[PDB]
Amino acid sequence: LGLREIRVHLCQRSPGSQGVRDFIVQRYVELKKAHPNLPILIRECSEVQPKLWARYAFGQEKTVSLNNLSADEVTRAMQNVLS
Amino acid sequence: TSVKPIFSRDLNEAKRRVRELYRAWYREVPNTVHLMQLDITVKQGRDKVREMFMKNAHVTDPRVVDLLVIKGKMELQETIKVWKQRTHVMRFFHETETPRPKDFLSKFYMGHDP
Amino acid sequence: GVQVSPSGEKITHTGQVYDEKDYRRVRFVDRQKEVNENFAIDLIAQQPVNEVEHRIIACDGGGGALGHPKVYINLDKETKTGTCGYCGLQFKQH
Amino acid sequence: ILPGAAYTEKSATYVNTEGRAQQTKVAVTPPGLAREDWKIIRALSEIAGITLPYDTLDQVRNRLEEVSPNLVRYDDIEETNYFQQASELAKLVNQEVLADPLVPPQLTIKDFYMTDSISRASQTMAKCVKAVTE
Amino acid sequence: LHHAVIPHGKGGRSSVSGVVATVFGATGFLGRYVVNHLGRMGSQVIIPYRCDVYDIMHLRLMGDLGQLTFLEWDARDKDSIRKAVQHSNVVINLIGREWETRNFDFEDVFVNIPRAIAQASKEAGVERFIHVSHLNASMKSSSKSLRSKAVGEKEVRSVFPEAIIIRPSDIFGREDRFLNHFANYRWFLAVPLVSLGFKTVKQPVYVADVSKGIVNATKDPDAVGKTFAFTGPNRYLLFHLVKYIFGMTHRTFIPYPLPLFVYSWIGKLFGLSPFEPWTTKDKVERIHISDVMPTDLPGLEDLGVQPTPLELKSIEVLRRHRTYRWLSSEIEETKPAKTVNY
Amino acid sequence: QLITVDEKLDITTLTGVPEEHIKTRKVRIFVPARNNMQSGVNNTKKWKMEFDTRERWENPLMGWASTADPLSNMVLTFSAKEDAIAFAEKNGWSYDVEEKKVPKPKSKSYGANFSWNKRTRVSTK
Amino acid sequence: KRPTVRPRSDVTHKQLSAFGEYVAEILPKYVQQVQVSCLDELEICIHPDGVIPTLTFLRDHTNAQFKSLADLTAVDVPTRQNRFEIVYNLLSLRFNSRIRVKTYADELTPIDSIVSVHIAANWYEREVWDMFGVFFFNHPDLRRILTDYGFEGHPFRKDFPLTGYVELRYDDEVKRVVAEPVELAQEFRKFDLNSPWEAFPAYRQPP
Ligand SMILES: NC(=O)C1=CN([C@@H]2O[C@H](COP(=O)(O)OP(=O)(O)OC[C@H]3O[C@@H](n4cnc5c(N)ncnc54)[C@H](OP(=O)(O)O)[C@@H]3O)[C@@H](O)[C@H]2O)C=CC1
Ligand SMILES: [Zn+2]
């Protein structure tokens, strides 16, 4: 039912993940301030297509493949996850 | 890609030989349960034939199929003749091996194997 | 050292004896377990020290080519004594 | 009690300080009726009504991929970033530091040889302690 | 749980199971299958015997090194039983004759020997005890065998509760005394049957099913204080059963009726035999009393065994009796037997 | 003449092994590490291909070590790595490849042991 | 002159090198890599299509009457994609000499048979098929020899376990010599014996 974890998956040099780095450096601090008790895991790798998992109360995991996205659309889809 | 054949231009011309071999086995089973006094019925012998055929239905390489046809003809020779005894034929059925459990929890109850 | 356990079995120089609940005591029913009574620990303990004059000597078994390889043992220590690796004889100097 | 297996007796992943994930290889099977840990949890699950999706080791490794994909990357150290973000996000909280010194627990070699379960149940480490303290 | 009892291996030879067992009627027709099924998966099997060492040789095999220990005993001599059950988890009783002898009566086989073994097993501290009575065993019966088995089934429960009592029907196997017994009525030119065999119902079971059931009963956490009806499927009628035997064995079939008293007298005079006799009064009675419906007892399927039907295994045992001109003949030339439910 | 076979070279229907030791099994392709007792490195230089280990147990008679798998004492050797991947893909084994571990070259100097300023001035000889 | 080492001549080496040039330049459509060893054993290596022509040549040619087949082996080397190195040891009886013809194969690249040249090759080709899995074309019988009738596997392949995948024993339940899977009371103890030191610099593989 309720949200329990988000976890962000991305790359450091691959450009399809570009948008998640900018989104992080821009909005991650404000987002954590808005949701301090909540965690959001950021685990990056060499060559992985980005994702955004979210785990609700039971083992209910739901993804969106945010490959080759902007930063504003990343924020929009993340707010869609939160809401 | 770009390899030599054996007895088969393509897979359909191999399935031809496959069906010839299935035929020879189907026509041989009633004579083998009779000559050497097996204690089975002809129905389950032929079901064993179809089982040991469908044990290799995933294959698509013509060369592998031709080699399997060759080995089937060898076993058919051995069985048409009595070069092999009741022991070897009833070896196929596994009349003593308990069924390998195809379930997780049973394997966990007995053994560390996957 | 062929003292027995309370389960009645003889104990070997490799102290081995089966437990009471160990089902592997069956095989000694109407039978026994072979154990050698002559323990080499107590036997080689029943052997005196061969005093010598030098700080370095050699040891073979005593037959030469029928014993063991020649090894040299130092005898500078006085609190304890020398010991061969193959055999277990002991040496000391005055 | 549910008897588990030691690092010598299961194929598993252990991440070091650097973040390098490293793969154990099974050397000796575990004794008695002891079994792997995740195997036990999956069996308990099937006994209950959850019946977790995976049933082998490759599947659990793929699940580890789903959670943190750094862990299937064996011996492949990964370059992290975003320390400035942690700094901005940690300067916010304000908790005083005590006027207390900070001594470590492992101060002498006496305290080094027994800090574990395997280490605490061992004759050699106990012998080394007996040697140092005497 | 000693470490030597932990089951290691892939469930086969040269492995370990934790089924350290004594099998007392091991030198017989059912004991050989029990020992084979215990040794096939890895388990030590103590085999007490009185027979010559020549008649334990087929048992000398069927076990890896050490997993088969033999030692001699005497039912008259207590202190030969504690010797055996001192080291075990399980004790399996398969002792039973089909005839009395000048030394051993039926009480002294089906009552006193189980009771002795059970006292010794409750003193030793074994965890299980598998007794093997009969399906028809009842104190209100016509045969001395069945009533003695009832007495023993009761007294074993009294002295050793947490026991297991398996009640098979007429078992058939290669060296049985049931199907071969019917088939050996050809030397005499006709088979007698009380009431022409009708009004008699037989539900026979294969040996391997009984053996697998015993071998799982010594491992199942359930089956600790419970009876069992090892019956097999396909309740047959005795006339049609013998007809199927004499069709599989392609000889002939000249049946005729015979009252129970003259057939009993025949059994008696055939029982006057210093050797292993052929027919006896109690065998006749046991042949001519129907099998009980097992509908109020668990059976094989509640223990992990699919009953093999007799039409699947009969040729293996009955080809020994076929002549040339019929030996090389298949199972599908015998018009199988009519069944009943009753 | 020739044929155009696309699919992966597969041989398991020829090898005469059970499905068990094909599908269940896992394979480690690697160069073995040098024994740190010996300073020699010739036991390296060849890619090997071992199998996963399985249950051994104490034989109840003497205490010998028993097995239920025949691939226990199994070792192959390959001059290269792609040969090993090929053999495994061909025989139907899932593999894990451990890359080649080569020691770093290093700058030795017997004169650094007798320096005027550095900490390499060893107190011994 | 040195006693412990083996004596050495050169005339055999020169003769066999000359005959190697002979075969190499007379039969170029098939021949690869003629070689003569320290011990003078000539060794010609052949494309698998050249088997019958080369063997017929060495049998029937006048200056090469290699009309006796001594061995017909095979050698599994899992590294190379064409695993099975197949060997043909021959002798002449006219020149008191031997030669070795070699070819290569794979699990699915069989070779023409040689009964049309050397009838001795019948049972050897059968042995090679049984042991290594090399099929031979236009062979009369080509069944197993050495393995049991109901036998899956090519044992002398290097990827085959020494102890096998099946084991036999008699069972009273069925009165047959059934075949159970393999379960040994003592695992074969593999020993790691090779020393970590270059013993022979002459064969030193460079990287
Ligand atoms: N058709 C069947 O087999 C059926 C069997 N059962 C039950 O199965 C069990 C065994 O059947 P089965 O195997 O046919 O019996 P068997 O006659 O085939 O073998 C019986 C065993 O009992 C031993 N035995 C008999 N009398 C004595 C004695 N006085 N002292 C010591 N040992 C003795 C014999 O050992 P030795 O040979 O050394 O004397 C023999 O091995 C019995 O409990 C019987 O009631 C039930 C229904 C049908
Ligand atoms: Zn000495």
PDB file of N, CA, C and O in Angstrom, chain B residues 49-104:
ATOM      1  N   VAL B  49      10.005 -45.852 -26.411  1.00  0.00           N
ATOM      2  CA  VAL B  49      10.620 -45.401 -27.655  1.00  0.00           C
ATOM      3  C   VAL B  49      10.303 -43.930 -27.890  1.00  0.00           C
ATOM      4  O   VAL B  49      11.191 -43.119 -28.178  1.00  0.00           O
ATOM      5  N   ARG B  50       9.030 -43.562 -27.757  1.00  0.00           N
ATOM      6  CA  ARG B  50       8.666 -42.173 -27.999  1.00  0.00           C
ATOM      7  C   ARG B  50       9.261 -41.250 -26.944  1.00  0.00           C
ATOM      8  O   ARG B  50       9.597 -40.100 -27.244  1.00  0.00           O
ATOM      9  N   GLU B  51       9.421 -41.740 -25.716  1.00  0.00           N
ATOM     10  CA  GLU B  51      10.046 -40.951 -24.662  1.00  0.00           C
ATOM     11  C   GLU B  51      11.506 -40.676 -24.979  1.00  0.00           C
ATOM     12  O   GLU B  51      11.969 -39.533 -24.883  1.00  0.00           O
ATOM     13  N   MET B  52      12.255 -41.714 -25.347  1.00  0.00           N
ATOM     14  CA  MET B  52      13.662 -41.539 -25.667  1.00  0.00           C
ATOM     15  C   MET B  52      13.868 -40.830 -26.995  1.00  0.00           C
ATOM     16  O   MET B  52      14.994 -40.415 -27.286  1.00  0.00           O
ATOM     17  N   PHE B  53      12.816 -40.686 -27.801  1.00  0.00           N
ATOM     18  CA  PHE B  53      12.869 -39.788 -28.951  1.00  0.00           C
ATOM     19  C   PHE B  53      12.647 -38.339 -28.536  1.00  0.00           C
ATOM     20  O   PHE B  53      13.405 -37.451 -28.935  1.00  0.00           O
ATOM     21  N   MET B  54      11.602 -38.078 -27.747  1.00  0.00           N
ATOM     22  CA  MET B  54      11.311 -36.726 -27.284  1.00  0.00           C
ATOM     23  C   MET B  54      12.296 -36.227 -26.240  1.00  0.00           C
ATOM     24  O   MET B  54      12.198 -35.070 -25.824  1.00  0.00           O
ATOM     25  N   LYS B  55      13.222 -37.073 -25.794  1.00  0.00           N
ATOM     26  CA  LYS B  55      14.349 -36.639 -24.986  1.00  0.00           C
ATOM     27  C   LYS B  55      15.329 -35.766 -25.763  1.00  0.00           C
ATOM     28  O   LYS B  55      16.199 -35.144 -25.145  1.00  0.00           O
ATOM     29  N   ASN B  56      15.198 -35.692 -27.094  1.00  0.00           N
ATOM     30  CA  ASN B  56      16.131 -34.978 -27.952  1.00  0.00           C
ATOM     31  C   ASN B  56      15.407 -34.171 -29.017  1.00  0.00           C
ATOM     32  O   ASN B  56      15.946 -33.954 -30.107  1.00  0.00           O
ATOM     33  N   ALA B  57      14.193 -33.713 -28.726  1.00  0.00           N
ATOM     34  CA  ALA B  57      13.415 -32.969 -29.703  1.00  0.00           C
ATOM     35  C   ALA B  57      13.816 -31.505 -29.793  1.00  0.00           C
ATOM     36  O   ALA B  57      13.498 -30.849 -30.789  1.00  0.00           O
ATOM     37  N   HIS B  58      14.493 -30.979 -28.775  1.00  0.00           N
ATOM     38  CA  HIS B  58      14.944 -29.594 -28.802  1.00  0.00           C
ATOM     39  C   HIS B  58      15.995 -29.326 -29.869  1.00  0.00           C
ATOM     40  O   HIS B  58      16.237 -28.162 -30.197  1.00  0.00           O
ATOM     41  N   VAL B  59      16.626 -30.364 -30.415  1.00  0.00           N
ATOM     42  CA  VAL B  59      17.777 -30.162 -31.280  1.00  0.00           C
ATOM     43  C   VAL B  59      17.330 -29.685 -32.655  1.00  0.00           C
ATOM     44  O   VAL B  59      16.261 -30.054 -33.155  1.00  0.00           O
ATOM     45  N   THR B  60      18.174 -28.859 -33.274  1.00  0.00           N
ATOM     46  CA  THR B  60      17.933 -28.319 -34.601  1.00  0.00           C
ATOM     47  C   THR B  60      19.122 -28.446 -35.541  1.00  0.00           C
ATOM     48  O   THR B  60      18.946 -28.243 -36.746  1.00  0.00           O
ATOM     49  N   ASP B  61      20.308 -28.755 -35.044  1.00  0.00           N
ATOM     50  CA  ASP B  61      21.446 -28.989 -35.916  1.00  0.00           C
ATOM     51  C   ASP B  61      21.205 -30.267 -36.712  1.00  0.00           C
ATOM     52  O   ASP B  61      20.946 -31.313 -36.104  1.00  0.00           O
ATOM     53  N   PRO B  62      21.257 -30.244 -38.048  1.00  0.00           N
ATOM     54  CA  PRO B  62      21.092 -31.502 -38.788  1.00  0.00           C
ATOM     55  C   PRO B  62      22.154 -32.533 -38.482  1.00  0.00           C
ATOM     56  O   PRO B  62      21.863 -33.734 -38.486  1.00  0.00           O
ATOM     57  N   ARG B  63      23.378 -32.094 -38.210  1.00  0.00           N
ATOM     58  CA  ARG B  63      24.478 -33.026 -38.013  1.00  0.00           C
ATOM     59  C   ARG B  63      24.285 -33.834 -36.737  1.00  0.00           C
ATOM     60  O   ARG B  63      24.502 -35.056 -36.718  1.00  0.00           O
ATOM     61  N   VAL B  64      23.868 -33.164 -35.664  1.00  0.00           N
ATOM     62  CA  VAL B  64      23.553 -33.854 -34.422  1.00  0.00           C
ATOM     63  C   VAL B  64      22.432 -34.854 -34.648  1.00  0.00           C
ATOM     64  O   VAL B  64      22.461 -35.971 -34.122  1.00  0.00           O
ATOM     65  N   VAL B  65      21.429 -34.472 -35.435  1.00  0.00           N
ATOM     66  CA  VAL B  65      20.302 -35.364 -35.672  1.00  0.00           C
ATOM     67  C   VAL B  65      20.755 -36.596 -36.433  1.00  0.00           C
ATOM     68  O   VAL B  65      20.313 -37.715 -36.152  1.00  0.00           O
ATOM     69  N   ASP B  66      21.630 -36.412 -37.415  1.00  0.00           N
ATOM     70  CA  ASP B  66      22.137 -37.553 -38.165  1.00  0.00           C
ATOM     71  C   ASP B  66      22.942 -38.485 -37.273  1.00  0.00           C
ATOM     72  O   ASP B  66      22.819 -39.709 -37.378  1.00  0.00           O
ATOM     73  N   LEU B  67      23.757 -37.931 -36.377  1.00  0.00           N
ATOM     74  CA  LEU B  67      24.519 -38.790 -35.477  1.00  0.00           C
ATOM     75  C   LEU B  67      23.606 -39.538 -34.518  1.00  0.00           C
ATOM     76  O   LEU B  67      23.855 -40.707 -34.191  1.00  0.00           O
ATOM     77  N   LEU B  68      22.541 -38.887 -34.058  1.00  0.00           N
ATOM     78  CA  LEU B  68      21.591 -39.572 -33.196  1.00  0.00           C
ATOM     79  C   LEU B  68      20.872 -40.671 -33.952  1.00  0.00           C
ATOM     80  O   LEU B  68      20.578 -41.730 -33.394  1.00  0.00           O
ATOM     81  N   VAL B  69      20.588 -40.437 -35.230  1.00  0.00           N
ATOM     82  CA  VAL B  69      19.990 -41.467 -36.067  1.00  0.00           C
ATOM     83  C   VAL B  69      20.939 -42.644 -36.204  1.00  0.00           C
ATOM     84  O   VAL B  69      20.524 -43.807 -36.170  1.00  0.00           O
ATOM     85  N   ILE B  70      22.228 -42.357 -36.352  1.00  0.00           N
ATOM     86  CA  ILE B  70      23.227 -43.414 -36.473  1.00  0.00           C
ATOM     87  C   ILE B  70      23.257 -44.260 -35.209  1.00  0.00           C
ATOM     88  O   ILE B  70      23.260 -45.496 -35.259  1.00  0.00           O
ATOM     89  N   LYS B  71      23.290 -43.603 -34.053  1.00  0.00           N
ATOM     90  CA  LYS B  71      23.335 -44.336 -32.795  1.00  0.00           C
ATOM     91  C   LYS B  71      22.043 -45.098 -32.548  1.00  0.00           C
ATOM     92  O   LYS B  71      22.062 -46.184 -31.953  1.00  0.00           O
ATOM     93  N   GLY B  72      20.918 -44.563 -33.018  1.00  0.00           N
ATOM     94  CA  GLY B  72      19.672 -45.294 -32.920  1.00  0.00           C
ATOM     95  C   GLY B  72      19.675 -46.532 -33.787  1.00  0.00           C
ATOM     96  O   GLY B  72      19.145 -47.572 -33.398  1.00  0.00           O
ATOM     97  N   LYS B  73      20.289 -46.443 -34.963  1.00  0.00           N
ATOM     98  CA  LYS B  73      20.411 -47.615 -35.817  1.00  0.00           C
ATOM     99  C   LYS B  73      21.333 -48.649 -35.193  1.00  0.00           C
ATOM    100  O   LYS B  73      21.107 -49.853 -35.330  1.00  0.00           O
ATOM    101  N   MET B  74      22.373 -48.197 -34.495  1.00  0.00           N
ATOM    102  CA  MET B  74      23.241 -49.121 -33.771  1.00  0.00           C
ATOM    103  C   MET B  74      22.476 -49.863 -32.683  1.00  0.00           C
ATOM    104  O   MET B  74      22.569 -51.093 -32.564  1.00  0.00           O
ATOM    105  N   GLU B  75      21.738 -49.123 -31.852  1.00  0.00           N
ATOM    106  CA  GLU B  75      20.956 -49.758 -30.800  1.00  0.00           C
ATOM    107  C   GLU B  75      19.893 -50.674 -31.386  1.00  0.00           C
ATOM    108  O   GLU B  75      19.600 -51.741 -30.832  1.00  0.00           O
ATOM    109  N   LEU B  76      19.329 -50.291 -32.524  1.00  0.00           N
ATOM    110  CA  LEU B  76      18.339 -51.129 -33.177  1.00  0.00           C
ATOM    111  C   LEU B  76      18.958 -52.408 -33.706  1.00  0.00           C
ATOM    112  O   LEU B  76      18.325 -53.461 -33.674  1.00  0.00           O
ATOM    113  N   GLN B  77      20.172 -52.328 -34.241  1.00  0.00           N
ATOM    114  CA  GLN B  77      20.897 -53.529 -34.634  1.00  0.00           C
ATOM    115  C   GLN B  77      21.100 -54.449 -33.439  1.00  0.00           C
ATOM    116  O   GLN B  77      20.790 -55.648 -33.493  1.00  0.00           O
ATOM    117  N   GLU B  78      21.616 -53.887 -32.344  1.00  0.00           N
ATOM    118  CA  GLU B  78      21.860 -54.660 -31.134  1.00  0.00           C
ATOM    119  C   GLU B  78      20.591 -55.302 -30.598  1.00  0.00           C
ATOM    120  O   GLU B  78      20.651 -56.374 -29.991  1.00  0.00           O
ATOM    121  N   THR B  79      19.444 -54.660 -30.796  1.00  0.00           N
ATOM    122  CA  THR B  79      18.183 -55.149 -30.255  1.00  0.00           C
ATOM    123  C   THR B  79      17.468 -56.108 -31.200  1.00  0.00           C
ATOM    124  O   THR B  79      16.836 -57.065 -30.743  1.00  0.00           O
ATOM    125  N   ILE B  80      17.539 -55.855 -32.507  1.00  0.00           N
ATOM    126  CA  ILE B  80      17.029 -56.797 -33.493  1.00  0.00           C
ATOM    127  C   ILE B  80      17.731 -58.128 -33.332  1.00  0.00           C
ATOM    128  O   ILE B  80      17.098 -59.186 -33.269  1.00  0.00           O
ATOM    129  N   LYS B  81      19.055 -58.095 -33.283  1.00  0.00           N
ATOM    130  CA  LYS B  81      19.802 -59.252 -32.843  1.00  0.00           C
ATOM    131  C   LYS B  81      19.741 -59.307 -31.321  1.00  0.00           C
ATOM    132  O   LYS B  81      19.166 -58.434 -30.671  1.00  0.00           O
ATOM    133  N   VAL B  82      20.325 -60.347 -30.744  1.00  0.00           N
ATOM    134  CA  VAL B  82      20.272 -60.558 -29.301  1.00  0.00           C
ATOM    135  C   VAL B  82      21.689 -60.422 -28.772  1.00  0.00           C
ATOM    136  O   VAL B  82      22.108 -61.133 -27.854  1.00  0.00           O
ATOM    137  N   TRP B  83      22.445 -59.513 -29.387  1.00  0.00           N
ATOM    138  CA  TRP B  83      23.741 -59.128 -28.859  1.00  0.00           C
ATOM    139  C   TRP B  83      23.619 -58.561 -27.458  1.00  0.00           C
ATOM    140  O   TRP B  83      24.529 -58.731 -26.640  1.00  0.00           O
ATOM    141  N   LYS B  84      22.509 -57.894 -27.164  1.00  0.00           N
ATOM    142  CA  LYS B  84      22.208 -57.393 -25.837  1.00  0.00           C
ATOM    143  C   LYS B  84      21.054 -58.170 -25.224  1.00  0.00           C
ATOM    144  O   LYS B  84      20.122 -58.590 -25.913  1.00  0.00           O
ATOM    145  N   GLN B  85      21.125 -58.329 -23.911  1.00  0.00           N
ATOM    146  CA  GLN B  85      20.254 -59.204 -23.155  1.00  0.00           C
ATOM    147  C   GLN B  85      19.144 -58.392 -22.493  1.00  0.00           C
ATOM    148  O   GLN B  85      19.084 -57.166 -22.601  1.00  0.00           O
ATOM    149  N   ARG B  86      18.246 -59.105 -21.803  1.00  0.00           N
ATOM    150  CA  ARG B  86      17.132 -58.483 -21.098  1.00  0.00           C
ATOM    151  C   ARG B  86      17.597 -57.385 -20.154  1.00  0.00           C
ATOM    152  O   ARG B  86      16.905 -56.375 -19.976  1.00  0.00           O
ATOM    153  N   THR B  87      18.774 -57.563 -19.557  1.00  0.00           N
ATOM    154  CA  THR B  87      19.345 -56.563 -18.669  1.00  0.00           C
ATOM    155  C   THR B  87      19.490 -55.218 -19.368  1.00  0.00           C
ATOM    156  O   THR B  87      19.045 -54.185 -18.856  1.00  0.00           O
ATOM    157  N   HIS B  88      20.088 -55.219 -20.555  1.00  0.00           N
ATOM    158  CA  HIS B  88      20.375 -53.970 -21.246  1.00  0.00           C
ATOM    159  C   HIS B  88      19.101 -53.261 -21.665  1.00  0.00           C
ATOM    160  O   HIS B  88      19.011 -52.032 -21.583  1.00  0.00           O
ATOM    161  N   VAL B  89      18.115 -54.014 -22.140  1.00  0.00           N
ATOM    162  CA  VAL B  89      16.871 -53.408 -22.593  1.00  0.00           C
ATOM    163  C   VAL B  89      16.097 -52.833 -21.420  1.00  0.00           C
ATOM    164  O   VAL B  89      15.636 -51.688 -21.464  1.00  0.00           O
ATOM    165  N   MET B  90      15.930 -53.612 -20.353  1.00  0.00           N
ATOM    166  CA  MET B  90      15.243 -53.095 -19.181  1.00  0.00           C
ATOM    167  C   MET B  90      16.046 -52.041 -18.442  1.00  0.00           C
ATOM    168  O   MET B  90      15.522 -51.429 -17.508  1.00  0.00           O
ATOM    169  N   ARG B  91      17.301 -51.827 -18.828  1.00  0.00           N
ATOM    170  CA  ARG B  91      18.055 -50.686 -18.329  1.00  0.00           C
ATOM    171  C   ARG B  91      17.386 -49.366 -18.676  1.00  0.00           C
ATOM    172  O   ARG B  91      17.515 -48.393 -17.927  1.00  0.00           O
ATOM    173  N   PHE B  92      16.684 -49.310 -19.807  1.00  0.00           N
ATOM    174  CA  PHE B  92      16.066 -48.063 -20.243  1.00  0.00           C
ATOM    175  C   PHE B  92      15.019 -47.587 -19.252  1.00  0.00           C
ATOM    176  O   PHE B  92      14.873 -46.384 -19.018  1.00  0.00           O
ATOM    177  N   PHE B  93      14.287 -48.520 -18.654  1.00  0.00           N
ATOM    178  CA  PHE B  93      13.111 -48.198 -17.866  1.00  0.00           C
ATOM    179  C   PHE B  93      13.439 -47.632 -16.495  1.00  0.00           C
ATOM    180  O   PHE B  93      12.585 -46.967 -15.901  1.00  0.00           O
ATOM    181  N   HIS B  94      14.642 -47.875 -15.979  1.00  0.00           N
ATOM    182  CA  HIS B  94      15.030 -47.450 -14.636  1.00  0.00           C
ATOM    183  C   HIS B  94      14.075 -48.031 -13.594  1.00  0.00           C
ATOM    184  O   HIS B  94      13.404 -47.317 -12.848  1.00  0.00           O
ATOM    185  N   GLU B  95      14.036 -49.358 -13.553  1.00  0.00           N
ATOM    186  CA  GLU B  95      13.117 -50.097 -12.699  1.00  0.00           C
ATOM    187  C   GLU B  95      13.603 -50.224 -11.262  1.00  0.00           C
ATOM    188  O   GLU B  95      12.982 -50.954 -10.483  1.00  0.00           O
ATOM    189  N   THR B  96      14.687 -49.541 -10.898  1.00  0.00           N
ATOM    190  CA  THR B  96      15.230 -49.571  -9.546  1.00  0.00           C
ATOM    191  C   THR B  96      15.586 -48.203  -8.999  1.00  0.00           C
ATOM    192  O   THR B  96      15.681 -48.056  -7.775  1.00  0.00           O
ATOM    193  N   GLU B  97      15.792 -47.209  -9.850  1.00  0.00           N
ATOM    194  CA  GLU B  97      16.182 -45.882  -9.410  1.00  0.00           C
ATOM    195  C   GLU B  97      14.948 -45.135  -8.937  1.00  0.00           C
ATOM    196  O   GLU B  97      13.982 -44.990  -9.690  1.00  0.00           O
ATOM    197  N   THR B  98      14.972 -44.665  -7.695  1.00  0.00           N
ATOM    198  CA  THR B  98      13.859 -43.875  -7.211  1.00  0.00           C
ATOM    199  C   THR B  98      13.808 -42.557  -7.985  1.00  0.00           C
ATOM    200  O   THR B  98      14.839 -42.074  -8.462  1.00  0.00           O
ATOM    201  N   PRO B  99      12.625 -41.961  -8.143  1.00  0.00           N
ATOM    202  CA  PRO B  99      12.537 -40.726  -8.937  1.00  0.00           C
ATOM    203  C   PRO B  99      13.299 -39.590  -8.271  1.00  0.00           C
ATOM    204  O   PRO B  99      13.099 -39.298  -7.090  1.00  0.00           O
ATOM    205  N   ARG B 100      14.196 -38.980  -9.030  1.00  0.00           N
ATOM    206  CA  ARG B 100      14.815 -37.727  -8.633  1.00  0.00           C
ATOM    207  C   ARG B 100      13.719 -36.709  -8.319  1.00  0.00           C
ATOM    208  O   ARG B 100      12.931 -36.377  -9.217  1.00  0.00           O
ATOM    209  N   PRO B 101      13.611 -36.204  -7.088  1.00  0.00           N
ATOM    210  CA  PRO B 101      12.575 -35.202  -6.814  1.00  0.00           C
ATOM    211  C   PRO B 101      12.824 -33.924  -7.596  1.00  0.00           C
ATOM    212  O   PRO B 101      13.892 -33.316  -7.506  1.00  0.00           O
ATOM    213  N   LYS B 102      11.817 -33.516  -8.361  1.00  0.00           N
ATOM    214  CA  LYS B 102      11.875 -32.307  -9.165  1.00  0.00           C
ATOM    215  C   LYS B 102      11.314 -31.103  -8.421  1.00  0.00           C
ATOM    216  O   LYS B 102      10.796 -30.175  -9.053  1.00  0.00           O
ATOM    217  N   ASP B 103      11.414 -31.104  -7.093  1.00  0.00           N
ATOM    218  CA  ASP B 103      10.862 -30.073  -6.234  1.00  0.00           C
ATOM    219  C   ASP B 103      11.957 -29.533  -5.331  1.00  0.00           C
ATOM    220  O   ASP B 103      12.861 -30.262  -4.924  1.00  0.00           O
ATOM    221  N   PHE B 104      11.863 -28.241  -5.021  1.00  0.00           N
ATOM    222  CA  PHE B 104      12.832 -27.606  -4.138  1.00  0.00           C
ATOM    223  C   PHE B 104      12.847 -28.263  -2.767  1.00  0.00           C
ATOM    224  O   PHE B 104      13.873 -28.789  -2.323  1.00  0.00           O
TER     225      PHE B 104
END
